[PDB]
């Protein structure tokens, strides 16, 4: 019942009946739960001697709860640093080598934390203190490592690559790597906005990186401005939906209208605008039309990432 009860209580219930609870539970045995309710009554130091009194693991929730950020006033650096080694030690004897290397890195020790990583696989730990690190070798070895993944699935993967690759001064790696994410942002996740971001660093890094021919240079810059034109174009589309959905969709209609808009717009995107537009209006009969558009015009693409399943399906009961 007890374990129950503190489910329903938690870091927003009130410290004093946290305190109570911790203490009964102290006396009780019930440690894990005794150190969610300190952690939850800001008790780090309490919470900490608790899990190495009783030798107890770690989760990566436990040890971000006893992460005191920068920016708080809680702890100074030097207890701050202390108890992140002493954090990072003990998840380094429980064979959690990421996010020991999560918490030697956020204390200072960073390179043999890196390998550490890089040996364990964790995606979401390589993320986090390759940015918090501040390093070129680091950086390196990290976007190297997550350019390998499905990274669609994990948009701080993406955030992430980026980050590296320019802090690490690795610019024609970064260039690549801002277009593929501004193709796999806009042709899996249809994000424009996000893409038109990954553009605009794609050309920043591709006219700071030194090509080995100006001519090939000068094209991709070209392209990319091309590509940033008409994505801004249907950037303006959709944010004048909220303000004259007619105007956005006759843009639209007319983006399709343009020449080779697949290599910068995927058509299906547009399309699957329109059609969650129409659908959106219950006008199904419209929606339909611009599917078949559509299925003419791109018969290899997969129709599951343009347009939600719930979407297409929609239109099919209409």
């Known amino acids: 019942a007890l374990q129950l009860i503190a489910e329903d209580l938690d870091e927003t219930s009130d410290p004093a009946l946290l305190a109570r609870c911790s203490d009964f539970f102290?006396?009780?045995?019930?440690?894990?739960?005794?150190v969610e309710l300190l952690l939850a009554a800001r008790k780090y130091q309490e919470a900490l001697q608790l899990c190495l009194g009783q030798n107890m693991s770690i989760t990566e929730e436990m040890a971000?709860?006893?992460?005191?950020?920068?920016?708080?006033?809680?702890?100074?650096?030097?207890?701050?640093?202390?108890?992140?080694?002493?954090?990072?030690?003990?998840?380094?004897?429980?064979?959690?080598?990421?996010?020991?290397?999560k918490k030697y890195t956020q204390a200072g020790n960073k390179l043999k934390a890196m390998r550490a990583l890089l040996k364990s696989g964790d995606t979401e730990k390589i993320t986090f203190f390759a940015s918090v690190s501040r390093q070129k070798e680091i950086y390196i070895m990290a976007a190297n490592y997550l350019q390998s993944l499905d990274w669609r699935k994990e948009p701080e993967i993406m955030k992430n690559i980026i980050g590296f690759?320019?802090?690490?001064?690795?610019?024609?790696?970064?260039?690549?790597?801002?277009?593929?994410?501004?193709?796999?942002?806009?042709?899996?996740?249809?994000?424009?906005?996000?893409?038109?971001?990954?553009?605009?660093?794609?050309?920043?890094?591709?006219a700071k990186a030194k090509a080995k021919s100006p001519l090939d240079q000068e094209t991709r810059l070209a392209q990319l401005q091309s590509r940033m034109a008409l994505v801004k174009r249907f950037?303006?589309?959709?944010?004048?939906?909220?303000?004259?959905?007619?105007?956005?969709?006759?843009?639209?209609?007319?983006?399709?209208?343009?020449?080779?808009?697949?290599?910068?717009?995927?058509?299906?995107?547009?399309?699957?605008?329109?059609?969650?537009?129409?659908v959106r209006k219950e006008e199904y009969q419209t929606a339909y039309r611009f599917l078949e558009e559509m299925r003419r015009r791109l018969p290899l693409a997969n129709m599951s990432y343009y347009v939600s399943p719930q979407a297409v399906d929609a239109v099919h009961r209409g």
């Open 165 to 206: 690759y320019t802090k690490g001064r690795a610019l024609d790696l970064l260039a690549g790597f801002y277009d593929a994410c501004a193709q796999v942002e806009i042709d899996e996740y249809q994000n424009y906005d996000k893409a038109h971001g990954a553009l605009t660093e794609a050309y920043k890094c591709l």
């Open 64 to 101: 971000e709860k006893m992460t005191v950020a920068k920016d708080s006033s809680d702890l100074p650096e030097e207890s701050r640093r202390e108890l992140l080694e002493q954090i990072a030690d003990c998840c380094m004897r429980q064979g959690s080598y990421h996010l020991a290397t």
């Open 235 to 278: 950037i303006q589309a959709r944010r004048t939906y909220t303000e004259d959905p007619k105007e956005s969709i006759k843009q639209c209609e007319l983006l399709l209208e343009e020449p080779d808009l697949d290599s910068t717009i995927r058509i299906g995107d547009v399309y699957g605008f329109l059609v969650e537009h129409y």
């Open 26 to 34: 102290i006396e009780h045995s019930q440690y894990e739960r005794a």
